[PDB]
RNA sequence: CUCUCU
C-alpha cells in the first residue's frame, strides 16, 4: 500500500502480549494489520511464559502507522490490546505451520507433509 | 532487564 507521504524504514514486527492463544493469531494479525498496509509473513510462539507473534510487511510506512495505532492502544471492546514494536532481525523467515509459522505468498505453507515422487524418489523400489 | 536456526 504505502499510501502515506511520511517516512518509514523498519518492515517487521515483534507483536507481544496479544489477546490470543494459537495460530489463528497470525491470520488475525493479517485481518487487523491489513487495515493499515500489506502484511506479509507471520510466526506464532509462546515466548516461554508469554505469548508472541512475529510479522513482516511489504511496507515499513504502513508498519510505522500500525505501531503508532496498535502499540499506542487497542481499537474496540478492550479486545485488541497488542504490544507491537520493530525487530532486530528485520527480515523474518517462515518455517512451517507445523508448530511455528506461515506465509501468504507461499501456498499456505504446508506442514512438512509433502509426498515422494516415484519417477525419481522411491523409483528404485516404488512398491 | 523480552523477538522463531519446524
Swiss-Prot record:
Residues covered by the RRM domain: 13-89
Compartments reported by the entry: Nucleus
Superkingdom assignment: Eukaryota
Cross-link (Glycyl lysine isopeptide (Lys-Gly) (interchain with G-Cter in SUMO2)): 47
Subunit structure and binding partners: Monomer. Part of a ternary complex containing KHSRP, PTBP1, PTBP2 and HNRPH1. Interacts with RAVER1 and SFPQ. Interacts with IVNS1ABP (via BACK domain); the interaction is direct.
Summary of the function given for this chain in its UniProt record: Plays a role in pre-mRNA splicing and in the regulation of alternative splicing events. Activates exon skipping of its own pre-mRNA during muscle cell differentiation. Binds to the polypyrimidine tract of introns. May promote RNA looping when bound to two separate polypyrimidine tracts in the same pre-mRNA. May promote the binding of U2 snRNP to pre-mRNA. Cooperates with RAVER1 to modulate switching between mutually exclusive exons during maturation of the TPM1 pre-mRNA. Represses the splicing of MAPT/Tau exon 10.
Entry protein name: Polypyrimidine tract-binding protein 1
Higher taxonomy: Eukaryota, Metazoa, Chordata, Craniata, Vertebrata
Residue numbers of the full-length protein present here: 172 to 298 of 557
